[PDB]
Design a protein around this ligand. Structure first.
Ligand SMILES: O=P(O)(O)OC[C@H](O)[C@H](O)[C@H](O)COP(=O)(O)OC[C@H](O)[C@H](O)[C@H](O)COP(=O)(O)OC[C@@H](O)[C@@H](O)[C@@H](O)CO
Ligand SMILES: O=P(O)(O)OC[C@H](O)[C@H](O)[C@H](O)COP(=O)(O)OC[C@H](O)[C@H](O)[C@H](O)COP(=O)(O)OC[C@@H](O)[C@@H](O)[C@@H](O)CO
Ligand SMILES: O=P(O)(O)OC[C@H](O)[C@H](O)[C@H](O)COP(=O)(O)OC[C@H](O)[C@H](O)[C@H](O)COP(=O)(O)OC[C@@H](O)[C@@H](O)[C@@H](O)CO
Ligand SMILES: [Cl-]
Ligand SMILES: [Cl-]
Ligand SMILES: [Cl-]
Ligand SMILES: [Cl-]
Ligand SMILES: [Cl-]
Ligand SMILES: [Mg+2]
Lengths: 314, 315, 318
């Protein structure tokens, strides 16, 4: 049984993929203790991506999907089915691992009986930013969702204990193109106890209508409110309130109301947002950061003018 | 007939009550020209309050209520029934009178044929604050409600002409725990003409819910304005109502409820009561409300919580 | 012997001060035989004071007396149009003044540039109604554009209009409302012609200041939007949206009672006013909204939603 399976979807990455694969093969961890599973989502770049992968024949596991799924969920699920390791680590095909990432994260996890180990993120170039607050207290052996800002770091670019995934049948969902990674991490967090944060290095380097989206958000709230770990109803309210805050600070199209979106699309978007939030108990609202009090109430009331106004006052 | 009856409810005041009673008994006014009427609202502090009062036996009038009413209204009404003086003065059992208060206020009242005399308030310690603007123009023999800020000084800690109370059957009401003193003063103001303000000293020293009952009291305030036999002109009534609305928005109970930590359902119920009350007040009064409150007032009339929240964010 | 210009001037109870206006028209650099002043009195009742002034210029002006006071400039202006057989007309308000070079300079610039419309720079005397400025900030413009030369911000009829455009398209002043009928006339003209000129060498026209449910007003505004959306000149639908959006902006910047929402207007009148405003705007395609200046995004949406509180709030944030 391998210590770690690194699971990496590819699609039309081309020659730049060398740098990523190289970062995985050059680890302090013993090469025989881990594997890189590459799942190509039917690249169509005149064989450029496949030619890169072929250069590492014998050194990686590889599966080619027959059709392009359009999303990371299907290839990630494929990778999960192929892994029989102790832990999995998801890697995006443009990113880099620090040479000490697998060894340091695995060892910290084993030492602390961790279900989840989160290594400090670094970033290369302007673009998507990375979580920071989660790493500001140094190494944490037994982290807390609220106190260690975990709902602000919900990517799957982390080390997950495979048995938790298997026992709870946690799969990436394919309903929406967005936030399915958050749902996966939330489902995992709500079904496990032991989370660890490791900050010695930048272990992982990120390299730079709403029907479906809000169905995914709805699943996030459902996962919190059915958690067998966080069973206490007031605790669930606190967690839900924190997710609401994160959604208002960082969600997709957070500033839609005053945007150039067509009126009819704003109405439909807000309608989906409103329906989703109105399934979340009002008891969670007091745990939302209070600068958002008006915006949250405007969304509950499904009132576009009031959302527009709330955004002008923020 | 005494010049003044000082009416003072007590409840579990204990030893500190000495200081208050002493301030009343030590006045420049001739001791035989006034009386202190103490009405105990059934203190239950192991006889501590009653023992203080007993030390002034023979020197004060005293009545013990058999049950604790829970507010000042019942003991104040008891005091009114007991007084046959020319003027009454209500005193809270923690407060102090300046030594010249009864004489100076009475004399100013008699000289100006005053129905109401208001002496300058001082305050000791943080807590409930006192009116200031009413006293910034010095002594005023014939004050005006609007120009002399009287709707911002509606406590009953004042000297009231007893005949006005008797003829108009003005009693403290007991519906709510709050604002019943405002209602009394408003009823008095709306049934009298002559008000005086005296500022030579700090004559009186203040020493530091669904809304169903509170808004019923507020409703009575507006009714008193609109049935005033003194202020009979309808436009004048609108002006007075508008001024009360302003005071309510500046100083009312839970004025900032909309963005508070109150539960949503309680905000809705509170605003519902507020809205019902305000919507019995003619819209003709709205133009006499200080105009920074125009949006907040309209939001309340529309019973629209989001709009009230927004109005408060812009104030 | 078709005249170059007919100046059309309604009068009502102007009295002795009318001398100054009439004199400004008779003292032009243009040859006196090349133009005419048509005076239409809207039944003055000032003990013959206005008529006595006009009588002093008998034989130098054309004159028509209306039997009843219409109450607005539309009827007398229409009377003037029927009487004119000139190449161009120029509307003049009875309190205002023409610069001595106005008819000659504007006509010549128009003839040189085949202009349907010539706009001379406005000056103003005394505090009161203001005059457009941005339209004149680029100097002389031979072939102006409605959007780039701010023409929707200068919609008075105090301008030189080619008469054939008025005749062919049967453009008449409407009498439904007491307000904005001049805007509608200018808009109808603009939407049925191509060539506009701006002349700024002098203050050619001097505005002299002397010291409502909305049912009719918004019906007039409705006609403005209809004229834009049926323009045979601006036929492209996206261009129509752009023009409509610009008019909406002008309406929100300068319209009648623009700040009604937070005013001391009675509540029921605010509601009725907003109701008329809302009904009118909701006949204008939402595709025009992106061409409205975006500080007005909330106010415009509040009006579309017929929501008084939201209009009040929008005005507090502007
Ligand atoms: O109001 P509170 O007290 O609750 O917190 C306010 C603080 O300011 C708080 O510390 C900040 O919200 C946290 O800022 P940060 O610098 O730690 O992190 C910012 C964001 O979390 C970060 O930039 C990303 O937006 C987080 O993305 P992920 O959690 O990795 O989401 C998964 C990702 O694959 C994707 O689903 C989304 O990123 C798509 O936008
Ligand atoms: O020109 P406007 O009217 O738009 O502006 C008003 C001015 O700014 C005015 O000067 C202030 O509103 C008032 O100035 P102030 O500092 O002299 O007065 C402050 C308050 O009136 C005062 O702190 C309290 O409101 C006193 O309340 P009272 O009317 O004396 O009695 C109420 C009390 O007995 C009780 O009923 C309530 O406190 C319990 O709900
Ligand atoms: O369009 P944007 O958002 O990029 O910016 C607009 C500018 O900020 C500005 O508004 C423009 O340059 C125009 O400003 P202005 O100073 O040149 O002119 C202001 C107004 O156009 C003018 O003061 C009048 O309000 C316009 O009236 P008119 O169109 O000449 O005729 C209307 C009048 O005859 C009548 O219909 C009613 O106004 C009488 O009640
Ligand atoms: Cl999101
Ligand atoms: Cl109050
Ligand atoms: Cl002459
Ligand atoms: Cl244009
Ligand atoms: Cl207008
Ligand atoms: Mg609203």
């Amino acid at each position: 049984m391998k210590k770690v399976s690194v699971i990496m979807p590819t699609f039309n990455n081309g020659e730049k993929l060398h740098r990523t694969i190289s970062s995985v093969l050059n680890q302090t961890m013993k090469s025989t203790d881990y594997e890189l599973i590459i799942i190509d989502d039917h690249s169509n770049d005149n064989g450029e991506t496949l030619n890169v992968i072929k250069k590492y024949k014998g050194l990686v596991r590889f599966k080619q999907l027959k059709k392009n799924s359009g999303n990371a969920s299907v290839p990630r699920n494929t990778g999960l089915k192929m892994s029989k390791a102790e832990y999995v680590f998801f890697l995006d095909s443009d990113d880099l691992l620090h040479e000490r990432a697998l060894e340091d994260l695995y060892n910290y996890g084993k030492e602390n009986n961790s279900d989840l180990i989160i290594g400090k993120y670094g970033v290369e170039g302007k673009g998507r930013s990375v979580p920071k607050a989660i790493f500001e207290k140094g190494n944490v052996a037994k982290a807390d969702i609220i106190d260690n800002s975990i709902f602000y770091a919900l990517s799957v670019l982390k080390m997950f204990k495979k048995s938790v995934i298997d026992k709870n049948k946690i799969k990436f969902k394919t309903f929406s193109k967005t936030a399915e990674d958050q749902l996966f991490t939330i489902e995992f967090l709500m079904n496990s106890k032991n989370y660890s944060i490791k900050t010695d290095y930048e272990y992982y380097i990120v390299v730079n209508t709403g029907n479906q989206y809000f169905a995914t958000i709805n699943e996030i709230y459902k996962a919190i409110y059915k958690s067998p770990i966080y069973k206490n109803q007031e605790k669930r309210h606190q967690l839900a309130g924190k997710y609401t805050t994160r959604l208002l600070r960082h969600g997709q199209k957070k500033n839609f109301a005053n945007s150039k979106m067509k009126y009819e699309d704003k109405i439909e978007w807000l309608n989906n947002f409103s329906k989703t939030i109105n399934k979340v108990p009002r008891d969670s609202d007091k745990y939302v950061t209070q600068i958002f009090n008006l915006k949250l109430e405007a969304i509950r009331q499904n009132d576009l003018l009031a959302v527009m106004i709330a955004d002008k006052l923020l």
